[PDB]
Amino acid sequence: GGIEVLDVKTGPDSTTTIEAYLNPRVGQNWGFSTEITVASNGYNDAPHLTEIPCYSSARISLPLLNEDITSPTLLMWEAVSVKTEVVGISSMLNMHSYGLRAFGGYGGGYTIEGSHIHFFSVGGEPLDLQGLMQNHSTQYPSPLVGPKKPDGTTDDSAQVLNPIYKAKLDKDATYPIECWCPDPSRNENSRYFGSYTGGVETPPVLSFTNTSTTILLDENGVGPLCKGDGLYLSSADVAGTFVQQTSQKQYWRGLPRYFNITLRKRAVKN
Amino acid sequence: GGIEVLDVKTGPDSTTTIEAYLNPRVGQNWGFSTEITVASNGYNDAPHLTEIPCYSSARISLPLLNEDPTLLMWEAVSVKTEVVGISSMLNMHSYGLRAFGGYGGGYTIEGSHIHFFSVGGEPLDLQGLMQNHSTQYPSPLVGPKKPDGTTDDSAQVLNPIYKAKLDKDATYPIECWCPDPSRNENSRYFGSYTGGVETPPVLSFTNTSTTILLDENGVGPLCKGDGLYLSSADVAGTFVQQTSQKQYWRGLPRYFNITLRKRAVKN
Amino acid sequence: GIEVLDVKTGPDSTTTIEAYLNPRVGQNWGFSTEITVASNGYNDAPHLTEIPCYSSARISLPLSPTLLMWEAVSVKTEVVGISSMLNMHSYGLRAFGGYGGGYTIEGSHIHFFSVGGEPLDLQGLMQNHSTQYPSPLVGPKKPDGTTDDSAQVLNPIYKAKLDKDATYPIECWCPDPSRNENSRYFGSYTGGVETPPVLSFTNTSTTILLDENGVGPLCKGDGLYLSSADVAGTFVQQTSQKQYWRGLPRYFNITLRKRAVKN
Amino acid sequence: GGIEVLDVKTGPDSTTTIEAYLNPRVGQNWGFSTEITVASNGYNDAPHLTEIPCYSSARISLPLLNEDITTLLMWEAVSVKTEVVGISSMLNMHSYGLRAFGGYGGGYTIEGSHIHFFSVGGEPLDLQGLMQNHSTQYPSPLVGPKKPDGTTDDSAQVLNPIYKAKLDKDATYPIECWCPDPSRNENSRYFGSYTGGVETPPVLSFTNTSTTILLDENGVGPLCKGDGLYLSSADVAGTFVQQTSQKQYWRGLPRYFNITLRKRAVKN
Amino acid sequence: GGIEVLDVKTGPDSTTTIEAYLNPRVGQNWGFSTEITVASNGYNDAPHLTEIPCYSSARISLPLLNEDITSPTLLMWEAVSVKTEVVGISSMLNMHSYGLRAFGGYGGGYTIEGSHIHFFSVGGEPLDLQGLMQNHSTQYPSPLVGPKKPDGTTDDSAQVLNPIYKAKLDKDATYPIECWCPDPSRNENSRYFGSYTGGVETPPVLSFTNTSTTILLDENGVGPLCKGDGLYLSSADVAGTFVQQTSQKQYWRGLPRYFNITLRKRAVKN
Ligand SMILES: [Cl-]
Ligand SMILES: [Cl-]
Ligand SMILES: [Cl-]
Ligand SMILES: [Cl-]
Ligand SMILES: [Cl-]
Ligand SMILES: [Cl-]
Ligand SMILES: [Cl-]
Ligand SMILES: [Cl-]
Ligand SMILES: [Cl-]
Ligand SMILES: [Cl-]
Ligand SMILES: [Cl-]
Ligand SMILES: [Cl-]
Ligand SMILES: [Cl-]
């Protein structure tokens, strides 16, 4: 960030690893939303709290570094690398748990399918969010938070980029995926990675391995610096929809994300 | 360009970064076109101004250089670029045509899409090519015309007579203008089109990705008149409305983060 | 959590082991029995013979303040019998209104293998917490025998070791990314109703099992742990229009070297 | 070719770049074929001249080389920047396409089976005969695989060396009966990709930042015999599906070439 | 593999290149099978000879090396590299040759589509085949060869891996693709490469170029050593099915494969 970055402290107990998971927040806590609803044209677009998928977020507490915050050089934890995994991909190989049945009702149940998003960020502070949504008029129930101008309104500009609509991902299960994307004009002290696929019946493609590592160092060899000795993890893994037999109703299906972050002590001015 | 390129000036205040965004121009300003129309066979192909998606374009003003013993020009070295609001499409409740015979959720944006951006030291060079030479574009849109005002059958293939400079936002339709590969020496452009009726869009986003703008000889776009030229075209697909079963083009904005350095040139 | 020393690097210091794991899709001859779907509000209690499981085996390897353990360095692995799917005459649901050939295997599929120095660590996660697995299958249970709603997401209480072939259902158990320090695992799932399988085969491909520090899986008790899950898709039978899981076998060729460790 | 290749001449005026385009030859000249026809079973397979897509080809004239009294020099094609022009033309759902969502939606963008292919060569591209239906009747002036006697037997559906030709005329050799001959083309570099299916979506990229090296395993590029550069193209993006008629038309796209050549010394 | 490999002989006439093609063997010789048939449930699965696609195979005769077979060091040809191409991909851009017509009969004919396999091997001996098939009970007409135990039977194990079912690809147009895969437990002296795609109407994707070369040398820099001065080529290129208009019957469509192999003389202990 806008800190002056100095030498990497090295030695034993200059590096630590944190293991964490984020369970999905698809509108309920057990990995499925309630049924997806669609207001009739000309009616209010006011979906149920429990059908709006949100970003998962957590701040992990790191070991205290500076006894005096007033020393003229500080130590901050620097996130160097992350091993991350989407847990329970194998759970989707299930054609018997009440899925809409293929081949005119004689086949097995539909495995999870439809539009999906997979996304994670590691950061030294809350992730910066830019407001952008499909329908400016959408009404999010409390306690969810959506793009608002200072006056409380939400005009047509919220369907494109208007800098007036910004927020910090500072609470789990609160910021809907559908009205908030990572702000590419900020997040200097965060690394984020996302992939969205659309379509009605699109098959999800997900891989898993313990052999994959992502470097979090930027073009200048600096990783996220954890302000207040706090590591900020964010997740969004909506694998697709579950299509229920007989009802033919659709439910968002979320998956949890494992994190394994490596950090090292780093010196900064002030 | 047709300038003689010399040494990279280095020192304090020899590099700068510019941040910009281009909002989409899909025919209106709030990211959706009006309904897509299709003339009956034998009728004029004359679509509405507000249903024709166009290239977004802007010229960013750079610091003045040769105010103050060699000639200097800004050289665009790299760009971090992002399509903003991809997450907006994970929305199955905002009036989309409903799946599984009307009992399921609304269709997320789908269909044919184009994603494209250019960084340049001058206006982007456009070659005329369109699906239907007879198409009638309402004013103020601009489409391929010969000098006499006509548009013959050759405009469906390559005819060098049909050329233009992308010199105005929301004006040049994506469907009749492509980047001219015979020119654009002083511009770097990147585009991907996918077709199909219900094709799912696939879009990624990260702040960890950089594109080098230097050519085979280590030279980036040189900003003539101290002006950086950005262009965008991000039509994510169509929105399919429930009940009407009408289709609307859906555009997305594009963030740019360009790094430039001072470069010396002879005339 | 061992202290790893020098690679012993002399005569009789390397060996290669060949093995195959046949699939465990619910029966032993590469097809499950018909996939069943309880009516809404009825118990989700599928047949033993319709639940695909992880294949697993422990290969026995050759038999002081410094010890020698076998270190798995590399693996050549292959999914055998991919060519078996080019078959449009063996009773498949027929295309083009019954006049065409039978459907080749299609639908949702998973391909997965692990090489390890100990049993593969499994985390419990399933689509439906209420699912009832017949004996002798094992599914996520708390210590008290219950299985609450948390088993649809990550709850650390639901863990197991892949210590028996044809026993742990693919659908309620994934590799635990919080453990498996001494195992290398690789998996790819594709969903969809009629999704075409895409599978490649060659004897020219090798996977390195060494980690970021050049250490491979260390075989505790002189035992190499292999695991497999290759559900190619479903077979769609003509007339019945019923679906059967189709499994494929996996060949392993592992190279190991002697490695020195403290204790 | 069967020349002995020597040193790369370097100096002033030892390299040049040529710009060219090939417009598509899908059966007419304005980027669409006439309607695709399908004979009834048992009837002759005799499609219209104007519904058979062909290879585009051109020979560009290079500067004359052996004229100075001071080794003999041929132009060597080193690299090519190539682009499919007018990909953006396909983002069009208003020009009479079969309409989606039961007639209330927009027109179908181009879709279906497609082929994208280009070659750079020092001589005409070598073609091997292979076709789906040996009995197909190509109208004059099109050329299809024939034995010396004029016949075309069942072997033309697989590889029979008897069926060979040189791509020596634009808009003449149908894509469907001629592929690049991998047993020849020593002095040509070719690159092709075909995708099938009824409604398959075309995926096409465009950029001015991409270069293809034309040098072989021995660092030799195509050597332009008679000071002539041979370009070939085949860009059938897919079909246009017309509303109401529900008839299909092949849609071709033009291909830009930017070739870099250098002088190269050869012995007889 | 199995020979003591010594120095690479170098000199004039120490390298040679062979050009060959394998025409497809989809059940007839002109690139199409007869109609695909499907026995009714409970009836014998006994398809026609001319509807079963098989591996193409050929042994190319190489120049004689050893005048005395009794010399204590021999020369064998070593296959170093291969340029290989699937010929006639462009043949599929054909919507007028009697294909089932799109858009309710008013459109053009279906181009070849459906499940496909592309595969080639270069070897110093016949390719090793492992028996595995979808239906153990399938009855292959003479002269085709399918997995049999020594006693003549074919039990349920032939649907998975049973080492008892092995064969050498020693005859063209004889070993069905559907019951035989390359044996990964053998083929030490062969290099093989295969890709299968399934589905009913799956579009084939095939590329062609004269600029692509595959190295055949193993992890120890040894290529296939041609026993008896014979190079073994194998091919399987079933591009998909042809769907005929009116009949709505399906025919396997095969394509030929070009080979260009480079070999060098190599010394071995004897
Ligand atoms: Cl609207
Ligand atoms: Cl079908
Ligand atoms: Cl469920
Ligand atoms: Cl895999
Ligand atoms: Cl069965
Ligand atoms: Cl016929
Ligand atoms: Cl290409
Ligand atoms: Cl290329
Ligand atoms: Cl037309
Ligand atoms: Cl030949
Ligand atoms: Cl035919
Ligand atoms: Cl291949
Ligand atoms: Cl036929």
Residue numbers in the entry:
A (entry chain EEE), E (entry chain BBB): 22 to 291
B (entry chain DDD): 22 to 89, 93 to 291
C (entry chain AAA): 23 to 85, 92 to 291
D (entry chain CCC): 22 to 91, 94 to 291
Sentences from the paper on this structure:
We expressed and purified assembly-incompetent VP1 pentamers from all three viruses by following the protocol established for HPyV12 and solved their crystal structures at high resolution. All three proteins fold into the familiar VP1 pentamer structure. Superpositions of the VP1 pentamers of ShPyV, GhPyV, and FiPyV with that of HPyV12 confirm that the core VP1 structure is highly conserved (RMSD values of 0.65 Å, 0.83 Å, and 0.73 Å, respectively). In HPyV12 VP1, the BC2 loop comprising the Neu5Ac-binding site is formed by amino acids T69 to Q83 (T73 to E87 in TSPyV VP1), whereas the putative binding sites in ShPyV VP1, GhPyV VP1, and FiPyV VP1 include amino acid residues T61 to Q75, T57 to E71, and T58 to E72, respectively. We calculated all-atom RMSD values with PyMOL using the BC2 loop of HPyV12 VP1 as a reference. With a value of 1.82 Å, the BC2 loop of FiPyV VP1 shows the largest deviation, while the BC2 loops of ShPyV and GhPyV VP1 yield lower deviations, of 0.77 Å and 0.84 Å, respectively. However, FiPyV did not hemagglutinate chicken or human erythrocytes, suggesting an alternative receptor specificity compared to that of the related viruses, likely influenced by residues surrounding the conserved BC2 loop Neu5Ac-binding site.
